Nucleic acid binder design. Sequence first.
RNA 1: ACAU
DNA 2: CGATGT
Length: 136
Amino acid sequence: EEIIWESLSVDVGSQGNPGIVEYKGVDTKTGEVLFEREPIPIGTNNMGEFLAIVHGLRYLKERNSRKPIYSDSQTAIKWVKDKKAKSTLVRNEETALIWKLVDEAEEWLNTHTYETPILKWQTDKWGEIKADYGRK
RNA sequence: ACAU
DNA sequence: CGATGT
Ligand SMILES: [K+]
Ligand SMILES: [K+]
Ligand SMILES: [K+]
Ligand SMILES: [Mg+2]
Ligand SMILES: [Mg+2]
């Protein structure tokens, strides 16, 4: 089982969990940063991991790219497969933004098609995913 | 347990 | 040490 270097890698970063959430996508081969989301004041790690994958799907579809996406998040990979982010985060005025983005990401999944393989990055064998924030 |  | 998730 070897790395598919022709791929997009995504990851969340946070200050607190729940806390400030951001995410980015990079070229697995080169580390070039391809997209970065502006920090969201309150969210969870898994909401961010989910948004990162969906953004990657949208990014690759817009560019007519068949590359796979790597994520290190078992949870977010499943939520994308299910088209349903089963987050425990309370809905209130302070979490409204992240929940709106999650709802809109689900809505996109329910209205578009993709063949993009969504692959588990095998951290135990390969080290940290290339999109990691270096904060742990 | 496993993955963040 | 705390948290989010299957
Ligand atoms: K990190
Ligand atoms: K990790
Ligand atoms: K746990
Ligand atoms: Mg991650
Ligand atoms: Mg990371």
